[PDB]
Write a protein that binds this ligand. Structure first.
Ligand SMILES: Nc1ncnc2c1ncn2[C@@H]1O[C@H](COP(=O)(O)OP(=O)(O)OP(=O)(O)O)[C@@H](O)[C@H]1O
Ligand SMILES: [Mg+2]
Length: 1005
């Protein structure tokens, strides 16, 4: 009965169709209040723009007819008699229901009935401006349900064309247009159709139902039925309706039910026409104080896009914010940054992040909403931007609504997702171009170039001055960069950096990192004596020139990309690592990764410490080499042959650590480990993010822990937070861990003067890798800037992008009854590759990280054997087994790992964790070796010698049977390969198999 009542009241009052059941309840409970919630006022603004309490009041007069109040009085008088006239609870309940449907305000005095609400809404509408008079384009018959079919790429602009016929009229909203989706409910479509057909309106408006093919079967059927019913009853005969669908889905329910109404003249408009339309409808009057006053013809909506990453979108938004703070002459201008991370845009989260700004203090104050559409977002962008920028609205299932205010400036930072034209082209677009294009093409705020705050910054100036005096072969000995000084032009700086960057078409991020490295190095130089007219005299000549020529190479190592559908790796060992540091003491200089050798040419060259091959030549002159030798600078050192404590001292010196305490005597401080530690520390110092790619077990966690402990010096303090990222990891979790790490770093820095390290293990195993990109590159958390001067350092670990062998893939597809889904129907995939065919379940890397990722290196057989020996010795320390047993275990486990590595058709992943697991199994069997062997002898005696068994070898055989044997299908080959390392008579595969089988039989017995 109440559903029929609401349908009748909607047919009676037209504006009740602007809102749903819950929204109507909210308005009923809120309109009577004083003042109504800002949310309700916004919801009403979709009828009477800029609705205020005064307007709601002026509309509230005339609604309370004393006829309705007379109904209220007679109800409040009769209801008790009607109740006592009945005795059955059900009868009283029915009477109460009926009397509430007749007069609700009697029961609920703090609420408005549907009649009063409809009247108030109609009054508000009349209190508004002139109505909207839209005329359908040609090919669409007024009074008929014009069905337009087209391509997805044209579904949105087509609708737009329908509303450009009358461009003078304002842009539509949810009242007219509805972007259908599979989750769209019948209520929204019903309200749309009722608004289209029901009578009571004050103008002629078009009503569009876009992507109708996406509506569910039930919803489409209900919409058709409701449309027919509305057509039967009293309605609008000149109703302008459009129904757009995807030609690829013209076979669904709704496009079919109106197939007879299909239209062949699909509306279309030139991109320039749409541009002018949207621009004129976004332009803010000079009198309306808006954030748009500083954006491209006073436009309230903008797009900052780029073909690639690291080009200046967020920087453009920041400079805009600064321009607004400086121009509008207001003390504060909010800047709300919204990061979209979900692959499918979640409009609910954006609406929640926006709601706080519905307050009245913001409805007339400039604001800058910075919507960042990350690379993770794949579907839902066009619909979202159409809803928020053209339809200027957002909504949720609850009922809350958000309206786009012209006083606010919406800026979308999106990477071009490359029809005749792209969607984003319709909006006012600012295309940020990289340096190469910036120097080739070139002022125009639509095509920005090289910022001035950066060009005038030390980071870009000191390297620039040095390189400028370098290419001109000027005397760098006397030159000294003056703080704040500025020279040259952005063009020369760009040219020099591109010449020395080591990259063909770099981004602004790569160039910034190169500049930061060079600047940090040259500054740590100038702070020393070697490059000073005093403390030496003229002993060191060309020192600055050598420093530059070598730091360019160091930066080629620290900045050039290491990654190049799934092809992403170059390697770590294939590249040298010539590192030169200026120690914090300002007295010593550390050299590592290369050896300086003179030659016949009276020059000096850098050669690999391992191969002796030349890395680069003419790095310096023989005179400078001899001078630095006189200065006792370490050259051609072999850190591998040094003592442990000497290595620790040199390392803590380079890192500026004064103490030299070894926190872990087991960690081998080979040259490569120290080089990696120094790379991380340099990236921390110069400000470059640290994103490391390495297999599990390559030694990254251990290295990071060692570095943290070493910088600790023993001081008890949680200076490291190791967050293990998994598929279930979310953005909020990452932000929370980052904030916790920030607080901890503040505490540690103000107590012990230490630096905290937040490490992300397996970062690329979640869809929230964009949050990590923000924490590292953007230096922000959920839109909030990370507090500098916190001593916090972030590290990210990304697993490799590998694919199982075709043989292993076929073996898995053939397991059991095979995968329930096919490799074609799988929704989980990294583009075209199903995630189930990758070794590591990883997700695409944000483009801004790929140039930063580098390889930690694959564990060499030597390191594998050393770690295995360490594990077996740690075991011996408890089980107390002889040396022969240790040797046998080490050999058998190394051989097992080698076999599983060779067997790329059965195993594509090998790590030390499997070794630890096999050791744990061996220990378990050893502890139970006595009882197990006794029961085994008993079980063998029952069913039929003794053949005494060594508990160690027996346990090891069972452990190999559990870990490797069982999983394998080539068990015979594995046994043949592994028995060689077994003592006698256990060097026979058949004996391994027999012992495994006997243990299994015992267990099953
Ligand atoms: N003229 C410039 N344009 C852009 N960036 C510059 C410029 N000069 C220096 N930089 C540095 O380059 C970096 C550019 O980062 P930016 O915020 O533009 O990335 P982005 O455009 O958001 O890319 P993505 O959205 O893919 O991360 C900044 O950290 C900035 O310090
Ligand atoms: Mg950005």
């Amino acid at each position: 009965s109440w559903k029929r009542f609401v349908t009748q009241k909607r047919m009676e009052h037209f504006y009740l169709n602007f809102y749903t059941a819950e929204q109507l309840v909210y308005l009923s409970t809120e309109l009577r209040k004083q003042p109504p919630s800002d949310a309700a006022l916004t919801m009403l603004s979709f009828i009477k723009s800029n609705c205020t309490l005064r307007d709601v009041l002026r509309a509230s007069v005339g609604c309370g007819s004393e006829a309705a109040r007379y109904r209220m009085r007679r109800v409040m008088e009769e209801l008790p008699l009607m109740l006592l006239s009945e005795f059955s609870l059900v009868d009283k309940l029915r009477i109460i229901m009926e009397q509430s449907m007749r007069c609700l305000p009697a029961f609920l005095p703090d609420c408005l009935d549907l009649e009063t609400l409809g009247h108030c809404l109609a009054h508000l509408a009349g209190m508004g401006g002139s109505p909207v008079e839209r005329c359908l384009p040609r090919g669409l018959q007024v009074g008929q349900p014009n069905l337009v079919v087209c391509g997805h790429s044209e579904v949105l602009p087509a609708a737009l064309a329908v509303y450009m016929q009358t461009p003078s009229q304002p842009l539509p909203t949810y009242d007219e247009v509805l972007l259908c989706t599979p989750a769209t409910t019948f209520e929204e479509v019903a309200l749309l159709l009722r608004r289209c057909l029901t009578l009571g309106s004050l103008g002629h408006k078009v009503y569009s139902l876009l992507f109708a093919d996406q509506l569910s079967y039930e919803v489409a059927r209900q919409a058709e039925e409701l449309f027919h019913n509305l057509c039967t009853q009293q309605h609008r005969e000149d109703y302008q309706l459009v129904m757009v669908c995807d030609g690829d889905w013209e076979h669904c329910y709704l496009p079919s039910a109106f197939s007879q109404h299909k239209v062949f003249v699909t509306p279309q408009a030139p991109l320039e026409a749409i541009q002018a339309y949207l621009a004129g409808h976004y332009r803010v009057p000079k009198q309306t104080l808006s954030a748009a006053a500083v954006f491209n013809d006073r436009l309230c909506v903008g797009i900052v896009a780029s073909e690639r990453a690291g080009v200046g979108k967020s920087l453009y938004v920041k400079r805009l914010h600064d321009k607004m703070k400086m121009q509008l002459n207001v003390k504060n201008v909010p800047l709300k940054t919204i990061r979209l991370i979900d692959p499918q845009v979640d409009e609910s989260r954006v609406l929640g992040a926006l709601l706080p700004f519905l307050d009245a203090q913001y409805q007339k104050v400039p604001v800058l909403f910075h919507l960042d559409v990350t690379s993770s977002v794949q579907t839902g962008i066009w619909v979202f931007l159409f809803k928020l920028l053209i339809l200027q609205y957002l909504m949720d299932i609850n009922g809350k609504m958000w309206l786009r205010n012209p006083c606010h400036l919406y800026i979308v930072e999106i990477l071009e997702r490359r029809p005749q034209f792209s969607f984003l082209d319709i909006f006012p677009k600012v295309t940020c171009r990289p340096p190469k294009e910036v120097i080739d093409m070139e002022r125009s705020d639509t095509e920005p170039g090289m910022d001035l705050w950066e060009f005038c910054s030390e980071t870009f100036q000191r390297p620039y001055q040095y390189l400028r005096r370098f290419n001109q072969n000027q005397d760098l000995d006397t030159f000294q960069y003056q703080e704040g000084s500025v020279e040259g032009t952005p063009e020369e700086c760009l040219q020099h950096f591109l010449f020395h960057c080591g990259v063909i078409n770099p981004s602004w991020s790569e160039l910034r990192n190169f500049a930061r490295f060079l600047n940090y190095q040259l500054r740590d130089c100038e702070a020393s004596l070697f490059c000073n007219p005093s403390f030496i005299g003229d002993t060191l000549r060309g020192f600055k020139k050598f420093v530059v020529t070598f730091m360019i190479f160091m930066a080629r190592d620290f900045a050039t990309p290491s990654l190049h559908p799934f092809s992403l790796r170059k390697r770590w060992e294939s590249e040298p690592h010539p590192y030169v540091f200026f120690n914090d003491d300002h007295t010593t200089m550390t050299f590592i990764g290369f050896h300086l050798q003179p030659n016949i040419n009276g020059s000096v060259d850098a050669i690999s410490h391992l191969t002796g091959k030349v890395i680069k030549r003419d790095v310096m002159t023989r005179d400078l080499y001899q001078g630095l030798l006189l200065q006792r600078v370490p050259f051609n050192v072999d850190f591998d042959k040094l003592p442990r404590h000497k290595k620790l001292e040199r390392l803590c010196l380079t890192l500026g650590i004064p103490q030299a305490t070894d926190p872990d005597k087991t960690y081998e401080l080979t040259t490569d480990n120290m080089l990696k530690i120094l790379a991380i520390e340099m990236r921390f110092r110069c400000g470059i993010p640290v994103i490391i790619m390495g297999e599990t077990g390559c030694g990254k966690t251990r290295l990071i822990k060692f570095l943290s402990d070493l910088r600790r010096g023993g001081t008890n303090a949680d200076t490291i937070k190791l967050v293990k990222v998994h598929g279930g990891t979310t953005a909020d979790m990452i932000y929370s861990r980052v904030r916790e790490a920030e607080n901890v770093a503040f505490a540690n820095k103000d107590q012990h003067q230490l630096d905290t390290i937040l490490f992300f293990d397996e970062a690329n195993t979640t869809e929230a890798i964009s949050c990590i990109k923000e924490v590292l590159c953007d230096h922000m958390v959920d839109g909030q800037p990370l507090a500098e001067d916190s001593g916090l350092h972030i590290i990210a670990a990304c697993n490799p992008y590998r694919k199982h062998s075709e043989e292993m893939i076929c073996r898995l597809e053939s397991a059991g009854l095979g995968y329930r889904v096919s490799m074609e129907e799988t929704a989980d995939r990294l583009g075209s590759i199903p995630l189930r065919q990758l070794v590591y379940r990883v997700h695409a890397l944000p483009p801004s990280l790929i140039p930063l990722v580098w390889d930690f290196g694959q564990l060499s057989d030597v390191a594998e054997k050393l770690y295995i020996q360490q594990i077996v010795q740690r075991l011996v320390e408890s089980i107390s087994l002889d040396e022969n047993g240790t040797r046998v275990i080490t050999e058998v486990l190394c051989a097992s790992q080698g076999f599983m590595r060779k067997t790329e058709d059965e195993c594509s992943f090998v790590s030390l964790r499997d070794v630890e697991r096999c050791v744990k199994v061996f220990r378990w069997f050893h502890e139970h070796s006595a009882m197990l062997l006794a029961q085994l002898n008993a079980f063998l005696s029952k069913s039929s010698n003794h053949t005494e068994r060594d508990p160690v070898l027996w346990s090891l055989m069972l452990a190999i049977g559990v870990c490797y044997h069982a999983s394998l299908e080539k068990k015979d080959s594995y046994r043949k390969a592994i028995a060689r390392f077994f003592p006698k008579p256990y060097d026979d595969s058949r004996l391994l198999l027999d012992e495994i089988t006997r243990a299994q039989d015992l267990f099953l017995d």
